[PDB]
Write an enzyme that holds these catalytic residues in place. Structure first.
Site, PDB file in Angstrom:
ATOM      1  N   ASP A 168       0.813  -1.196   0.000  1.00  0.00           N
ATOM      2  CA  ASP A 168       0.000   0.000   0.000  1.00  0.00           C
ATOM      3  C   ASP A 168       0.849   1.248   0.000  1.00  0.00           C
ATOM      4  OD1 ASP A 168      -2.950   1.022   0.570  1.00  0.00           O
ATOM      5  OD2 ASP A 168      -1.564   2.202   1.874  1.00  0.00           O
ATOM      6  N   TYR A 198       2.753   9.650  -0.217  1.00  0.00           N
ATOM      7  CA  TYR A 198       3.809   9.022   0.570  1.00  0.00           C
ATOM      8  C   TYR A 198       5.203   9.360   0.028  1.00  0.00           C
ATOM      9  CZ  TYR A 198      -0.116   6.540   2.585  1.00  0.00           C
ATOM     10  OH  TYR A 198      -1.315   6.323   3.216  1.00  0.00           O
ATOM     11  N   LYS A 201      -2.619   5.840  -4.693  1.00  0.00           N
ATOM     12  CA  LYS A 201      -3.762   6.668  -4.336  1.00  0.00           C
ATOM     13  C   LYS A 201      -3.651   8.046  -4.957  1.00  0.00           C
ATOM     14  CE  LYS A 201      -3.832   4.806   0.454  1.00  0.00           C
ATOM     15  NZ  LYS A 201      -2.378   4.539   0.643  1.00  0.00           N
ATOM     16  N   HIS A 217      -7.548   8.962  -2.267  1.00  0.00           N
ATOM     17  CA  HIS A 217      -6.940   9.021  -0.953  1.00  0.00           C
ATOM     18  C   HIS A 217      -7.893   9.565   0.103  1.00  0.00           C
ATOM     19  CE1 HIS A 217      -2.644   9.066   0.886  1.00  0.00           C
ATOM     20  NE2 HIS A 217      -3.529   8.883   1.851  1.00  0.00           N
TER      21      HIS A 217
HETATM   22  N1  NAP Z   1      -5.609   5.745   3.488  1.00  0.00           N
HETATM   23  C1  NAP Z   1      -5.063   6.673   4.296  1.00  0.00           C
HETATM   24  O1  NAP Z   1      -5.436   7.813   4.386  1.00  0.00           O
HETATM   25  C2  NAP Z   1      -4.045   6.119   5.155  1.00  0.00           C
HETATM   26  C3  NAP Z   1      -3.712   6.762   6.319  1.00  0.00           C
HETATM   27  C4  NAP Z   1      -2.761   6.185   7.118  1.00  0.00           C
HETATM   28  C5  NAP Z   1      -2.222   4.991   6.716  1.00  0.00           C
HETATM   29  N2  NAP Z   1      -2.572   4.397   5.589  1.00  0.00           N
HETATM   30  C6  NAP Z   1      -1.931   3.164   5.273  1.00  0.00           C
HETATM   31  O2  NAP Z   1      -1.754   2.553   6.524  1.00  0.00           O
HETATM   32  C7  NAP Z   1      -0.461   2.022   6.515  1.00  0.00           C
HETATM   33  C8  NAP Z   1      -0.020   1.720   7.902  1.00  0.00           C
HETATM   34  O3  NAP Z   1      -0.773   2.408   8.871  1.00  0.00           O
HETATM   35  P1  NAP Z   1       0.136   3.336   9.777  1.00  0.00           P
HETATM   36  O4  NAP Z   1       1.224   3.741   8.875  1.00  0.00           O
HETATM   37  O5  NAP Z   1      -0.714   4.343  10.439  1.00  0.00           O
HETATM   38  O6  NAP Z   1       0.774   2.357  10.855  1.00  0.00           O
HETATM   39  P2  NAP Z   1       0.278   1.125  11.753  1.00  0.00           P
HETATM   40  O7  NAP Z   1       0.057  -0.006  10.818  1.00  0.00           O
HETATM   41  O8  NAP Z   1      -0.728   1.543  12.751  1.00  0.00           O
HETATM   42  O9  NAP Z   1       1.600   0.783  12.590  1.00  0.00           O
HETATM   43  C9  NAP Z   1       1.990   1.770  13.500  1.00  0.00           C
HETATM   44  C10 NAP Z   1       3.253   1.395  14.198  1.00  0.00           C
HETATM   45  O10 NAP Z   1       3.185   0.098  14.752  1.00  0.00           O
HETATM   46  C11 NAP Z   1       4.528  -0.323  14.919  1.00  0.00           C
HETATM   47  N3  NAP Z   1       4.521  -1.751  14.801  1.00  0.00           N
HETATM   48  C12 NAP Z   1       4.313  -2.422  13.644  1.00  0.00           C
HETATM   49  N4  NAP Z   1       4.367  -3.713  13.828  1.00  0.00           N
HETATM   50  C13 NAP Z   1       4.619  -3.872  15.155  1.00  0.00           C
HETATM   51  C14 NAP Z   1       4.783  -5.006  15.908  1.00  0.00           C
HETATM   52  N5  NAP Z   1       4.684  -6.261  15.338  1.00  0.00           N
HETATM   53  N6  NAP Z   1       5.024  -4.844  17.199  1.00  0.00           N
HETATM   54  C15 NAP Z   1       5.098  -3.613  17.690  1.00  0.00           C
HETATM   55  N7  NAP Z   1       4.964  -2.451  17.066  1.00  0.00           N
HETATM   56  C16 NAP Z   1       4.720  -2.663  15.780  1.00  0.00           C
HETATM   57  C17 NAP Z   1       5.270   0.246  13.742  1.00  0.00           C
HETATM   58  O11 NAP Z   1       6.573   0.668  14.148  1.00  0.00           O
HETATM   59  P3  NAP Z   1       7.894   0.161  13.375  1.00  0.00           P
HETATM   60  O12 NAP Z   1       7.813   0.875  12.105  1.00  0.00           O
HETATM   61  O13 NAP Z   1       8.933   0.654  14.296  1.00  0.00           O
HETATM   62  O14 NAP Z   1       7.897  -1.297  13.209  1.00  0.00           O
HETATM   63  C18 NAP Z   1       4.409   1.388  13.256  1.00  0.00           C
HETATM   64  O15 NAP Z   1       5.081   2.599  13.462  1.00  0.00           O
HETATM   65  C19 NAP Z   1       0.307   3.172   5.996  1.00  0.00           C
HETATM   66  O16 NAP Z   1       1.545   2.728   5.556  1.00  0.00           O
HETATM   67  C20 NAP Z   1      -0.539   3.487   4.820  1.00  0.00           C
HETATM   68  O17 NAP Z   1      -0.207   2.590   3.784  1.00  0.00           O
HETATM   69  C21 NAP Z   1      -3.472   4.928   4.784  1.00  0.00           C
HETATM   70  O1  WDV Z   2       1.416   8.593   9.330  1.00  0.00           O
HETATM   71  N1  WDV Z   2       0.977   9.571   8.714  1.00  0.00           N
HETATM   72  O2  WDV Z   2       1.165  10.754   9.024  1.00  0.00           O
HETATM   73  C1  WDV Z   2       0.171   9.326   7.527  1.00  0.00           C
HETATM   74  C2  WDV Z   2       0.305   8.093   6.931  1.00  0.00           C
HETATM   75  C3  WDV Z   2      -0.445   7.845   5.814  1.00  0.00           C
HETATM   76  C4  WDV Z   2      -1.294   8.804   5.314  1.00  0.00           C
HETATM   77  O3  WDV Z   2      -2.005   8.452   4.175  1.00  0.00           O
HETATM   78  C5  WDV Z   2      -1.428  10.046   5.910  1.00  0.00           C
HETATM   79  C6  WDV Z   2      -2.349  11.086   5.344  1.00  0.00           C
HETATM   80  N2  WDV Z   2      -3.661  11.229   6.038  1.00  0.00           N
HETATM   81  C7  WDV Z   2      -3.768  12.510   6.782  1.00  0.00           C
HETATM   82  C8  WDV Z   2      -4.985  12.414   7.664  1.00  0.00           C
HETATM   83  N3  WDV Z   2      -6.128  12.021   6.844  1.00  0.00           N
HETATM   84  C9  WDV Z   2      -7.357  12.178   7.523  1.00  0.00           C
HETATM   85  C10 WDV Z   2      -8.483  11.437   7.238  1.00  0.00           C
HETATM   86  C11 WDV Z   2      -9.644  11.653   7.933  1.00  0.00           C
HETATM   87  C12 WDV Z   2      -9.694  12.611   8.914  1.00  0.00           C
HETATM   88  C13 WDV Z   2      -8.580  13.355   9.201  1.00  0.00           C
HETATM   89  C14 WDV Z   2      -8.589  14.408  10.244  1.00  0.00           C
HETATM   90  F1  WDV Z   2      -9.230  14.012  11.358  1.00  0.00           F
HETATM   91  F2  WDV Z   2      -7.350  14.787  10.676  1.00  0.00           F
HETATM   92  F3  WDV Z   2      -9.195  15.546   9.790  1.00  0.00           F
HETATM   93  C15 WDV Z   2      -7.425  13.138   8.504  1.00  0.00           C
HETATM   94  C16 WDV Z   2      -6.026  10.822   6.025  1.00  0.00           C
HETATM   95  C17 WDV Z   2      -4.822  11.014   5.128  1.00  0.00           C
HETATM   96  C18 WDV Z   2      -0.678  10.309   7.039  1.00  0.00           C
END
Ligand code: NAP
Ligand code: WDV
Length: 314
Positions: free
Chosen positions: A45, A50, A79, A112
């Site tokens: 993803d 990013y 995205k 996105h």
């Molecule tokens: N669609 C969107 O708007 C959006 C927004 C946010 C995220 N995403 C997608 O969500 C993906 C991941 O979500 P996120 O980036 O918020 O992170 P997450 O999956 O919630 O992970 C958060 C943290 O958990 C730690 N972690 C991971 N595996 C672990 C384990 N086995 N044990 C302990 N800690 C662990 C990681 O640290 P370490 O790195 O140190 O391992 C990471 O910093 C993003 O890469 C993105 O692709 C999409």
């Molecule tokens: O780890 N990161 O910083 C990170 C990693 C991956 C990402 O795709 C992004 C980008 N996000 C920014 C927040 N956004 C959002 C969506 C809904 C509500 C709100 C609000 F509540 F903030 F308004 C914010 C979704 C897209 C940030």
């Protein structure tokens, strides 16, 4: 394993998160994604935002080149960023993303967010107030449909939509393709069960991001809010199954039929997270995790909370 999309394509139920903040050298993105693929991940993803597509594309092409994996073994998501919501810009943004990743097509292309900004990733007025835009997202979608029609993306979907915004696309006149998914913030403190049922009833997969509590990024997340992985129920269950809180959280999502994303830039945890296929939570385990929900979203903005398309109420 995978799951069938409302379009016929398959999506691996575990996905690798690739986002890392500016201070993590872009080189690093290439390594971790490679370890991810070697470890067992088959769903990756990324996003324009990013700013790592060159390396993620390389990572993939690197594992096709070492015979590890074929291309159709791999599910790659990018995205569309919010400065590109206008339909005449959808395709060029996708093409850009492909050219960066030296790739013929993405498996999944997402909107996105519904929070349109002004056609700079973060465009800003004389004072530093981020500049909103109002677009008809149904026209964005028709443009996304032309991209699928053109083989540039195998499957199309949305991200950060709520129920009402999804209904808007699902009842669009002349709708050609349902979104296959809706990638959203989802974890035991914010399980989105109501939205999960709706998505299910519309044959739309809910993909969970920040399922591990997020990266707790200073821009978005209030440092007061409790750390997901430190929850005592998630910790009790880790001991109980001799695993880690992370693994409990991921497996929780799988058993509700939610596709789950996991991000790590650490080789150990990257290898760990695939143990999610090695064990089962019980019915009691699941109802206990259900109880954790407290309507808490890690991402916040006072700025964006006043965007006409802000998805959460409150
Ligand atoms: N669609 C969107 O708007 C959006 C927004 C946010 C995220 N995403 C997608 O969500 C993906 C991941 O979500 P996120 O980036 O918020 O992170 P997450 O999956 O919630 O992970 C958060 C943290 O958990 C730690 N972690 C991971 N595996 C672990 C384990 N086995 N044990 C302990 N800690 C662990 C990681 O640290 P370490 O790195 O140190 O391992 C990471 O910093 C993003 O890469 C993105 O692709 C999409
Ligand atoms: O780890 N990161 O910083 C990170 C990693 C991956 C990402 O795709 C992004 C980008 N996000 C920014 C927040 N956004 C959002 C969506 C809904 C509500 C709100 C609000 F509540 F903030 F308004 C914010 C979704 C897209 C940030």
């Amino acid at each position: 394993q995978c799951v069938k999309l409302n379009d016929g394509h398959f999506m691996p139920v575990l996905g690798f998160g690739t986002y890392a903040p500016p201070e993590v050298p872009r080189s690093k993105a290439l390594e971790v994604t490679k370890l991810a693929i070697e470890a067992g991940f088959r769903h990756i993803d990324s996003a324009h935002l990013y700013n790592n597509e060159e390396q993620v594309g390389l990572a993939i092409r690197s594992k096709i080149a070492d015979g590890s994996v074929k291309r159709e073994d791999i599910f790659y998501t990018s995205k569309l960023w919010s400065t590109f919501h206008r339909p005449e810009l959808v395709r060029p943004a996708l093409e850009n993303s492909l050219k960066k990743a030296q790739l013929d097509y993405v498996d999944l292309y997402l909107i996105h967010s519904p929070m349109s900004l002004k056609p700079e990733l973060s465009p800003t007025d004389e004072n530093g107030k981020v500049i909103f835009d109002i677009v008809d997202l149904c026209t964005t979608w028709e443009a996304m449909e032309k991209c699928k029609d053109a083989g540039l993306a195998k499957s199309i979907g949305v991200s950060n939509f709520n129920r009402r915004q999804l209904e808007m696309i699902l009842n669009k006149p002349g709708l050609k393709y349902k979104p296959v998914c809706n990638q959203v913030e989802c974890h035991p403190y914010f399980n989105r069960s109501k939205l999960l049922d709706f998505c299910k009833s519309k044959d739309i997969v809910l993909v969970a991001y920040s399922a591990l509590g997020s990266q707790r990024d200073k821009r978005w997340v209030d440092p007061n809010s409790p750390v997901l992985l430190e929850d005592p129920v998630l910790c009790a269950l880790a001991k109980k199954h001799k695993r880690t809180p992370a693994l409990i959280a991921l497996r929780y999502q799988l058993q509700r039929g939610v596709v789950v994303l996991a991000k790590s830039y650490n080789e150990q945890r990257i290898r760990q997270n695939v143990q999610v296929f090695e064990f089962q939570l019980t019915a009691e385990d699941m109802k206990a995790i259900d109880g954790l929900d407290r309507n808490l979203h890690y991402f916040n903005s006072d700025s964006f909370a006043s965007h006409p398309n802000y998805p959460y109420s409150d």
